[PDB]
Design a protein around this ligand. Structure first.
Ligand SMILES: CCCCCCCCCCCCCCCCCC(=O)OC[C@H](COP(=O)([O-])OCC(O)COP(=O)([O-])OC[C@@H](COC(=O)CCCCCCCCCCCCCCCCC)OC(=O)CCCCCCCCCCCCCCCCC)OC(=O)CCCCCCCCCCCCCCCCC
Ligand SMILES: CCCCCCCCCCCCCCCCCC(=O)OC[C@H](COP(=O)([O-])OCC(O)COP(=O)([O-])OC[C@@H](COC(=O)CCCCCCCCCCCCCCCCC)OC(=O)CCCCCCCCCCCCCCCCC)OC(=O)CCCCCCCCCCCCCCCCC
Ligand SMILES: CCCCCCCCCCCCCCCCCC(=O)OC[C@H](COP(=O)([O-])OCC(O)COP(=O)([O-])OC[C@@H](COC(=O)CCCCCCCCCCCCCCCCC)OC(=O)CCCCCCCCCCCCCCCCC)OC(=O)CCCCCCCCCCCCCCCCC
Ligand SMILES: CCCCCCCCCCCCCCCCCC(=O)OC[C@H](COP(=O)([O-])OCC(O)COP(=O)([O-])OC[C@@H](COC(=O)CCCCCCCCCCCCCCCCC)OC(=O)CCCCCCCCCCCCCCCCC)OC(=O)CCCCCCCCCCCCCCCCC
Ligand SMILES: CCCCCCCCCCCCCCCCCC(=O)OC[C@H](COP(=O)(O)OCCN)OC(=O)CCCCCCCCCCCCCCCCC
Ligand SMILES: CCCCCCCCCCCCCCCCCC(=O)OC[C@H](COP(=O)(O)OCCN)OC(=O)CCCCCCCCCCCCCCCCC
Ligand SMILES: CCCCCCCCCCCCCCCC(=O)OC[C@H](COP(=O)(O)O)OC(=O)CCCCCCCCCCCCCCC
Ligand code: HEM
Lengths: 172, 101, 80, 54, 49, 64, 106, 113
């Protein structure tokens, strides 16, 4: 009955969007650099050169993003199992079945994607040779991390604002 | 088991209860809902009148060992007729004089 | 009303009593663990159910009334 | 500890008392309970000492 | 009042009333229904425990 | 009894108790998108199906 | 004809089969009640790629039988006599019947 | 000694359990507290069942006669067939769909009369 229904919430528990100074404070030097690089690459790729952007995107798709999408799709198919859920030789209730499927499948996809991220994101950050090498190369600082955090929040705000008028928007 | 023999056995068992339409309720007392329904639906008056029978916990071996009554103790207390009077399985204490000095 | 309910056909004497349950004497030929397992299985198979039955019988006999014939034989009741 | 335990076991066996520990006879060689008690009293404390020191 | 009957009645009157009550209770128990109730109560002692 | 235990393990892993769908899901979960044989070779699944952050048109067509 | 009648009666009243089964099993034996439950023969994902849990559950139930009309029901001895008489008649009709063993089992 | 102490503990525990499980049958406890507790439990159970029944009755009285049959079907199912395996919900769904067929026929008649 509040923002958690109509606002955007799929970007807050994924892609290291939750990384802040608390993790960096306890992290060692190398761990801090790796975390900062991961956050910057996921949220504000603009700070990276095109080659690094492409390489990091390929690694992310291979490890976390596409894997979570596939797992969510498998869970959604599991939900689809048994369709139509309620029907008989007289009526099939197509609208009710469509509503039930649309309500159930995306929830299972979300559960699967969240599971995949929770399981693999820490391992990907900790034990990825590509991420380690790129973090060593770039050597980001706490100031860079703070700038990236502000820029990521502003990007989320811009994305929310742009989709304000999805039906009618003359402009002037 | 032969199909015909099983069918005959089932029919005989069903008709043994009564040669008329009957109503059967199945309850699993281990479950809360089933137990509450079973206790609500079972009435002692019907069981006594034989309009209802419960099957599943027969436990027909209810014949006790005929607990012996303490005849010796009862006779010992009867012999004390100056203190206790026995009537209708009731022990009445004869009133005593608290002022005995 | 049930609080003040009373049953006058029950025996009026105390029903407390002693029951004998024979034991399994320790067997030195087995050993500590074998004897312990024997004792455990005996407790689970004979001693425990026997005591449970004794306690249930004690609980139920305190409610089971005495028959009229038994009352007459004991002299507790005189007919008419 | 081993000497005290052996002395106690010997004296109580001489008087006819044997602690009811271990089987009376062995499963394979039929070694007596007294012999196995002596063996255990000799070996177990050494193993415990080694483990504690390690 | 029923619980503390004895406090208000004399020995003889209490004995008379209690004897009448006990005789009537004995007759009621000897009535067939009470015997069936007691038999049913004793029937399932093992399961109820 | 070792052969009996092996037979019991095979039976417990049998299809009727441990679904092949569960096995496939476990394989996908344990393997990455470049090692998974079912999708590493296929560019369409790895890019067009699962590679797009928003594939509403294809999802709607598949659902229909 | 039997199958069509069963289908029509079940559709008219879903409790028809349940009532008949309860009536049959009321006085049935413990080994009769021990029988398993029906298995789903339908195919699809749950049969090919998934696993469908069986319908079997605990079978410790108490059958409370009450006469709709209200007539007195037969006691245990009367029921035993009725079953024995029916078994004797069936054996006379067919010597090879094992109704005696079935009854003696429980 | 140790065995006797263990058996004494076991006997006390068994007596306590037997009391706690079957004290409502006898009048050993003055005022029959366990008996009154059991009677109260049975009264609460019966009152809950009769409360469900009376709620069903009042809803039935207030329900329109057009869907009174559907309410009857749903009530009977929720009471009996929910916990029964032999009762196939497909037949109940078929009855509901027949009622819905009648309702749709009436609706279309009203729309296109
Ligand atoms: C314990 C477990 C349970 C509880 C927990 C559950 C948790 C999970 C929940 C989610 C998942 C499970 C869901 C289960 C329930 C599913 C639903 C259900 O119950 O189904 C049975 C049942 C469905 O009915 P049924 O008896 O089974 O019948 C089946 C149908 O026949 C089947 O349909 P059909 O096949 O008959 O087809 C019908 C079709 C007919 O098919 C056709 O032939 C189509 C005919 C129409 C064609 C044309 C279509 C386009 C028309 C356009 C018209 C103009 C539009 C204008 C729009 C303007 C917009 C501004 O009709 C249409 O679709 C056409 C109508 C379109 C809709 C209405 C349009 C409104 C327009 C605007 C109106 C106002 C304008 C005002 C203007 C100014 C004044 C004039 O449910 C109900 O009856 C009610 C259910 C209510 C559910 C409420 C749920 C609330 C949320 C709960 C969850 C969240 C909160 C937490 C709760 C926790 C517990 C307390
Ligand atoms: C502070 C720490 C945090 C936790 C809180 C604190 C917890 C404190 C717990 C204290 C527990 C005290 C228990 C006292 C028992 C006193 C028994 C007695 O009366 O003594 C006389 C008794 C005299 O024996 P007997 O009855 O005359 O029989 C001799 C006959 O000649 C021979 O008669 P037979 O041949 O006719 O038939 C018997 C024969 C028949 O053959 C058998 O049945 C032998 C079976 C051998 C084991 C088979 C499985 C192998 C796989 C490994 C174990 C996995 C667990 C599954 C075990 C399944 C059941 C065995 O078996 C025997 O010989 C019986 C004795 C077997 C002793 C050898 C095994 C010892 C270790 C057992 C496992 C302990 C847990 C390990 C967990 C994992 C650690 C990484 O003394 C003995 O001979 C045995 C004394 C054992 C004392 C154990 C003290 C343990 C203290 C440390 C506890 C913690 C351990 C590490 C885990 C830590 C977790 C945090
Ligand atoms: C590192 C070495 C340290 C050595 C220290 C010195 C002491 C031990 C060695 C002494 C050797 C010479 C002794 C004098 C011999 C005189 C002649 C004679 O008649 O013998 C006296 C007497 C036997 O005569 P008996 O009249 O036939 O008495 C039979 C009674 O049942 C016996 O009744 P009981 O009164 O003796 O009581 C049963 C026995 C308890 O005996 C049991 O039955 C307990 C069994 C526990 C099994 C736990 C799970 C094992 C899982 C597999 C492990 C694989 C190896 C891992 C190695 C890791 C790296 C070290 O003792 C107790 O329950 C009380 C003590 C509490 C347990 C403490 C045990 C500590 C043992 C430490 C040494 C282990 C060496 C392992 C060598 C490799 C084995 C593969 O010998 C002993 O008392 C010594 C027993 C030594 C342990 C035997 C274990 C047998 C079961 C092995 C199972 C796994 C392999 C199965 C292979 C199957 C075929 C392929
Ligand atoms: C915990 C261990 C995790 C290990 C992970 C390891 C990685 C591999 C995982 C493998 C399993 C998943 C992939 C294969 C699935 C195959 C399914 C299949 O074909 O079976 C046919 C199977 C046939 O059913 P059935 O066996 O006949 O049973 C009939 C029951 O009605 C059907 O239900 P049921 O009683 O059989 O139990 C399933 C039941 C739930 O059961 C559980 O909880 C499952 C518990 C965990 C089971 C784990 C099994 C796999 C273990 C693998 C690892 C083994 C390791 C061994 C090695 C050693 C380890 C030390 O699921 C549902 O039906 C849930 C639907 C409702 C949504 C609930 C969630 C959202 C909350 C909604 C609340 C609404 C309240 C009202 C409104 C409130 C408003 C405020 O179909 C289904 O059960 C369909 C389920 C559809 C929904 C599934 C997705 C929703 C969430 C499910 C529960 C949460 C777990 C999600 C997965 C977590 C993964 C980490
Ligand atoms: C007190 C509890 C409830 C509290 C919340 C109440 C919310 C009321 C508003 C409608 C809610 C519909 C169900 C929940 C949807 C949750 C997601 C959501 O609302 O997404 C946003 C979107 C509308 O947002 P919009 O303003 O158009 O987009 C601006 C973007 N910057 O959402 C939509 O466009 C979705 C709704 C479209 C209109 C549908 C009208 C008919 C109802 C259909 C419901 C879905 C089908 C369900 C069928 C099975 C269950 C019955
Ligand atoms: C939809 C209901 C139709 C009911 C028809 C019958 C009644 C007629 C009487 C007048 C009714 C006027 C109703 C106006 C509702 C406006 C709703 C609205 O504002 O919705 C949002 C929409 C665009 O917003 P969106 O891009 O989706 O996202 C949110 C933006 N922050 O906002 C806009 O589009 C901007 C505001 C537009 C207001 C227009 C009002 C006059 C419309 C006249 C249309 C006449 C022809 C319609 C067809 C024939 C009707 C008989
Ligand atoms: C013509 C057929 C072509 C395709 C054939 C093979 C398809 C097999 C896989 C199914 C599709 C999976 C798509 C996954 C990527 C994706 O969706 O990508 C688009 C987004 C990605 O989500 P994120 O942005 O959070 O990563 O998906 C979602 O938002 C969730 C939608 C559901 C996805 C899983 C499928 C559920 C079942 C679909 C039917 C139910 C209704 C769906 C809405 C109308
Ligand atoms: C194990 C399962 C599958 C394997 C191994 C597989 C493998 C492949 C491979 C190797 C290609 C060639 C990619 C390329 O051109 O480089 C391909 C293309 C394609 N596959 Fe699959 N595939 C599988 C399942 C599916 C399914 C289920 C669909 C559709 C429902 C599908 C649709 C396609 C399409 C449309 C193309 C063409 C893409 C293009 O031309 O760009 N495949 N597949």
């Amino acid at each position: 009955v509040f923002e958690f229904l109509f606002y955007n919430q799929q970007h807050k528990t994924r892609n290291g969007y939750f990384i802040n100074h608390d993790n960096l404070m306890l992290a060692s030097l190398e761990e801090r650099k790796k975390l900062i690089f991961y956050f910057i690459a996921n949220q504000v790729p603009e700070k990276l050169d095109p080659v690094d952007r492409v390489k990091f995107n390929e690694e992310l798709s291979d490890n976390l993003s596409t894997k979570a999408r596939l797992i969510g799709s498998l869970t959604g198919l599991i939900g689809l199992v048994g369709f139509p859920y309620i029907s008989t030789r007289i009526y099939s209730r197509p609208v009710l079945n469509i509503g039930l499927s649309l309500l159930i499948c995306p929830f299972l996809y979300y559960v699967g994607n969240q599971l995949t991220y929770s399981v693999w994101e820490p391992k990907f950050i900790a034990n990825n040779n590509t991420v380690c090498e790129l973090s060593k190369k770039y050597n980001f600082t706490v100031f860079d991390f703070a700038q990236a955090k502000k820029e990521a929040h502003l990007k989320a705000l811009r994305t929310e604002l742009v989709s304000d008028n999805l039906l009618y928007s003359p402009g002037i | 088991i032969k199909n015909t023999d099983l069918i005959v056995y089932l029919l005989a068992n069903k008709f043994s209860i009564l040669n008329d339409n009957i109503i059967v309720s199945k309850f699993n007392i281990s479950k809360f809902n089933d137990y509450i329904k079973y206790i609500n639906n079972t009435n002692s008056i019907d069981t006594y009148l034989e309009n209802q029978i419960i099957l599943g916990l027969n436990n027909n071996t209810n014949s006790n060992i005929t607990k012996n009554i303490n005849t010796k103790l009862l006779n010992s207390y009867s012999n004390l007729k100056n203190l206790v009077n026995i009537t209708n399985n009731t022990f009445y204490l004869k009133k005593i004089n608290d002022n005995y000095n | 009303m049930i609080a003040n309910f009373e049953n006058n056909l029950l025996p009026k004497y105390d029903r407390s009593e002693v029951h004998l349950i024979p034991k399994r004497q320790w067997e030195p030929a087995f050993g500590v663990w074998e004897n312990f397992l024997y004792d455990i299985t005996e407790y689970a198979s004979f001693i425990a159910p026997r005591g449970k039955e004794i306690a249930a019988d004690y609980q139920i006999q305190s409610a089971i009334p005495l028959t009229k014939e038994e009352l007459i034989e004991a002299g507790l009741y005189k007919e008419t | 500890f081993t000497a005290v335990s052996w002395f106690s076991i010997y004296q109580f066996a001489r008087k006819g008392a044997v602690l009811p520990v271990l089987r009376e006879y062995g499963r394979y060689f039929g070694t007596h309970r007294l012999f196995r008690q002596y063996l255990h009293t000799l070996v177990l404390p050494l193993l415990y000492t080694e483990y504690a020191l390690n | 009042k029923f619980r503390y009957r004895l406090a208000n009645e004399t020995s003889e009157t209490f004995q008379r009333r209690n004897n009448r009550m006990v005789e009537r209770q004995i007759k009621r128990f000897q009535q067939p229904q009470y015997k069936h109730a007691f038999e049913q109560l004793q029937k399932n002692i093992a399961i109820s425990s | 009894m070792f052969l009996g235990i092996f037979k019991d393990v095979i039976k417990l892993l049998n299809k009727k108790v441990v679904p092949v769908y569960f096995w496939f899901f476990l394989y996908c979960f344990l393997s990455t998108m470049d090692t998974n044989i079912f999708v590493s070779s296929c560019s369409f699944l790895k890019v067009e199906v699962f590679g797009k952050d928003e594939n509403t048109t294809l999802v709607l067509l598949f659902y229909v | 004809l039997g199958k069509l009648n069963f289908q029509k009666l079940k559709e008219t009243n879903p409790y028809f089969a349940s009532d008949i089964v309860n009536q049959l099993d009321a006085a049935a034996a413990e080994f009769i009640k021990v029988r398993p439950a029906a298995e789903s023969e339908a195919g699809g994902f749950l049969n090919s790629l998934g696993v469908s849990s069986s319908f079997n559950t605990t079978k410790n139930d108490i059958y409370v039988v009450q006469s709709a009309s209200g007539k007195k029901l037969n006691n245990k001895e009367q029921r035993e006599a009725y079953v024995l008489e029916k078994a004797q008649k069936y054996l006379k009709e067919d010597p090879q019947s094992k109704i005696l063993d079935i009854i003696a089992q429980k | 000694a140790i065995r006797n102490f263990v058996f004494k503990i076991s006997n006390q525990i068994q007596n306590l359990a037997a009391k706690r499980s079957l004290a409502y049958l006898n009048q050993i406890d003055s005022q029959s507290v366990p008996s009154r507790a059991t009677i109260n439990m049975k009264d609460q159970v019966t009152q809950m069942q009769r409360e469900i029944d009376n709620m069903a009755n009042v809803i039935r009285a207030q329900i329109p006669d057009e869907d009174r049959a559907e309410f009857e079907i749903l009530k009977k199912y929720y009471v009996t067939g929910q916990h029964d395996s032999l009762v196939d919900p497909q037949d109940v769904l078929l009855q509901l769909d027949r009622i819905q067929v009648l309702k749709n026929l009436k609706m279309i008649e009203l729309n296109e009369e």
